[PDB]
Amino acid sequence: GMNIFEMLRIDQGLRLKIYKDTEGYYTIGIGHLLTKSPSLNAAKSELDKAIGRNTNGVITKDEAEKLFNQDVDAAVRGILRNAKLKPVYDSLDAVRRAALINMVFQMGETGVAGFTNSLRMLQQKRWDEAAVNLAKSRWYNQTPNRAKRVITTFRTGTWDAYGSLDYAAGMASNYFHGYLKLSLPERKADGLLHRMNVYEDKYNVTFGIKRLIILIPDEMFINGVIQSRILEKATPLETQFINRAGVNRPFKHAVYRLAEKVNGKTYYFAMEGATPMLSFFEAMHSNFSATWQMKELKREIWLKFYTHLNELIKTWPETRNLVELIIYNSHDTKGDLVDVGEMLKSHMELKT
Amino acid sequence: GMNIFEMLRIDQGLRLKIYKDTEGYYTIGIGHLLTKSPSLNAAKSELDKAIGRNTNGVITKDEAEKLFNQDVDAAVRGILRNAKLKPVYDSLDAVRRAALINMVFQMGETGVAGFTNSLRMLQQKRWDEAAVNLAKSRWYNQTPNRAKRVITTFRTGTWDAYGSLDYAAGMASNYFHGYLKLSLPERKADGLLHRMNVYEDKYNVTFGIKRLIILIPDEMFINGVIQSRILEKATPLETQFINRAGVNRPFKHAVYRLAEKVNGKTYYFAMEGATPMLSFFEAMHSNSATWQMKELKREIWLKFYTHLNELIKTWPETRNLVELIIYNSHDTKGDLVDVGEMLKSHMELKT
Ligand SMILES: Nc1nc2c(ncn2[C@@H]2O[C@@H]3COP(=O)(O)O[C@@H]4[C@H](O)[C@@H](COP(=O)(O)O[C@H]3[C@H]2O)O[C@H]4n2cnc3c(N)ncnc32)c(=O)[nH]1
């Protein structure tokens, strides 16, 4: 997944070979200082003594990880001893503490202690106020890319600002950029709401909610189709064509309708299963044999996919009010398969 | 992102709460025996001694990974002290060493030493012979799934048996299972080759390559289109409809043709860019282009091509249906590369 190592590999960068930092000092891995000597062989001697073998200037990714956590433990020790930094650290969460270790590695302890007013707002949990003040910082001007991510990590307490670099978040990002953000927002005279308005006027029907509903069950659909006792498949929305990767690509959204009246109305729904999860389920079934180890990993990817997808949809105004994510267990507590048509009927009743 | 910890998390399993093994002994993490005492609080105190805090039976993934690396360090010390295992371990690279340590975690140090013939070919770096020899063992019979992944690690020296849940290899897996293998092979009387044969007969044209060409540039298409001075867009292939997660999904392929004849013939090509890389590039540009991210871009870009190419060749339904073209968007001079000249050169070679 995502942790402090992957975060600082983004902001600082990883080097499996010896390099020089901004002050010309020999360094390796993620900002692990070897020596202040201009001698390259003296830097190799310290590198060999730190790992236990004559690496001759090249180390493994695992060895670079075992150097980095030592520097994290050593940086925490100094943070706890520094009187200007320990009260902010003690009241911060681990994700925000990891963000607090981030600027420590970049500018040092004295530089982080310079932001006396921003640390005091983080200590008081005023996440929005210290986000605005770090934007005005000189550290923001020198590194505009890195300042935003540490700010958002302090403001949200999540790994959102570091994009999609693991398997789960990347499935949501490709889902988002390649389909949701691409085809649903109104662009030119076309878009999701436009297609639904043309659909409602053509068939004289009413959509229960004017959003694309995405089903994210923990298990793929039985027989690969949406199984329901009161929901039937209807004519899809008119296909919209969008140039994508050299193809005038057709994008189609399926439409289903309740076979039973709710409040005297037949409700339609533009909806679909979360097909990335289906492609993930299919890929996993071909490589692994459904052990308890895989079920935990599948559910872990399953949850992270929804959380990152829901975060991407909310942060972008073009898609904030266009998608409805429904994540659920395919079986109820009694063990029976959940009827998505019943879920939609109940949702329509709970507001009308 | 795959390593020995994530490998044993696949094969053996990670439990963050104190549990009891097959012999009724309290265990934590990935098979870390805590104590043989029936006292649960004795297991909690022993776990507190190993972690360094009042866990009371529950630990985090980082603590369990740190505890697992200690168990690996102890297993390596035992392997180096074993005269039967030390020579092969010294000769093996880091990845193949993890496959050896995987077996020690499963059957113990004395069990791995019995593979005398098997350890010899590994020491002499005969990977294919060692992979065949290991498949004959009883260890392959009791636990076949775990053995095949360890044997492939000995055979290839990579993490290809386990790394399907990494970003690049995972996006290639979704790209392969959810699109390439889904819609290109021939189902009933439909598929890519059928659409291309219908296309050649309707328009009386000839495809230069009887495959779907997937362009993998290191940079997004300019204005989202394929730029070329000798390629031009033609009528696309007829759209194929496949039911997919409740949607009658359309699968359409664009067709391009060479603007100039190659020995009197105009050659057509079904081709498109790699949509997982386009989304990845779009996401990288939103979250700027420092050297840290430029190396990470090329890293995922390279790993996506290699794992997608492996999946295409592994399955016979797709082995001769896809043509992957990975290339730098600019030459050394800095000029933009015309993808059509690459295809014209491909055509001029055997025609
Ligand atoms: N109802 C509806 N949903 C659509 C349509 N097009 C896409 N979706 C969704 O967007 C996701 C991203 O697809 P992508 O084109 O950006 O790359 C995909 C994906 O990486 C991989 C597996 O697809 P899937 O798991 O179903 O995720 C896709 C889907 O959920 O293969 C790529 N892929 C799938 N189809 C194509 C295609 N025609 N051309 C190129 N790449 C494809 C839609 O039209 N309707």
Numbering used by the authors:
A (entry chain B): -14 to 337
B (entry chain A): -14 to 272, 274 to 337
Please give the exact wording used by the authors of the publication that reports this structure:
Cyclic GMP–AMP synthase (cGAS) is a cytosolic DNA sensor that produces the second messenger cG[2′–5′]pA[3′–5′]p (2′3′-cGAMP) and controls activation of innate immunity in mammalian cells. Here we show that cGAS-like receptors (cGLRs) are innate immune sensors that are capable of recognizing divergent molecular patterns and catalysing synthesis of distinct nucleotide second messenger signals. In support of this conclusion, Hartmann, Imler, Cai and colleagues have identified cGLR2 as a second functional cGLR in Drosophila and have demonstrated in vivo that cGLR1 and cGLR2 have discrete roles in Drosophila immunity. Together, our results define cGLRs as receptors in animal cells that are capable of detecting diverse pathogen-associated molecular patterns and dictating response to the foreign environment.
Drosophila STING (dSTING) is known to function as a cyclic dinucleotide receptor in vivo, but an endogenous nucleotide second messenger has not been previously identified. We therefore developed an in vitro thermo-fluor binding assay to analyse dSTING recognition of specific CDNs. dSTING preferentially formed a thermostable complex with 3′2′-cGAMP and exhibited no detectable complex formation with 2′3′-cGAMP or other CDNs in vitro. To define the mechanism of selective 3′2′-cGAMP recognition, we next determined a 2.0 Å crystal structure of the D. eugracilis STING (GenBank XP_017066673) CDN-binding domain in complex with 3′2′-cGAMP. dSTING adopts a highly conserved V-shaped homodimeric architecture with a deep central pocket that binds to 3′2′-cGAMP. Each nucleobase of 3′2′-cGAMP is stacked between dSTING Y164 and R234, and E257 specifically coordinates the 3′2′-cGAMP guanosine N2 position. In human STING, high-affinity recognition of 2′3′-cGAMP requires readout of the 2′–5′ phosphodiester linkage by R232 in the β-strand lid. In dSTING, the equivalent R229 makes no contact with either phosphodiester bond. Instead, R229 is repositioned to extend outwards from the ligand-binding pocket by the deletion of a single lid residue and the formation of a salt bridge with E267 on the opposing protomer, explaining the diminished affinity of dSTING for 2′3′-cGAMP. In addition, a key asparagine substitution, N159, in dSTING extends across the binding pocket to coordinate the adenosine 3′ OH in 3′2′-cGAMP and directly replaces the human STING S162 residue that contacts the guanosine 3′ OH in 2′3′-cGAMP. We tested a panel of dSTING-mutant proteins and confirmed that mutations to each coordinating residue disrupt the formation of the dSTING–3′2′-cGAMP complex. The unique adaptations in the ligand-binding pocket observed in the dSTING–3′2′-cGAMP structure are widely conserved in Diptera and together explain a mechanism for how specific 3′2′-cGAMP-dependent signalling drives the activation of dSTING.
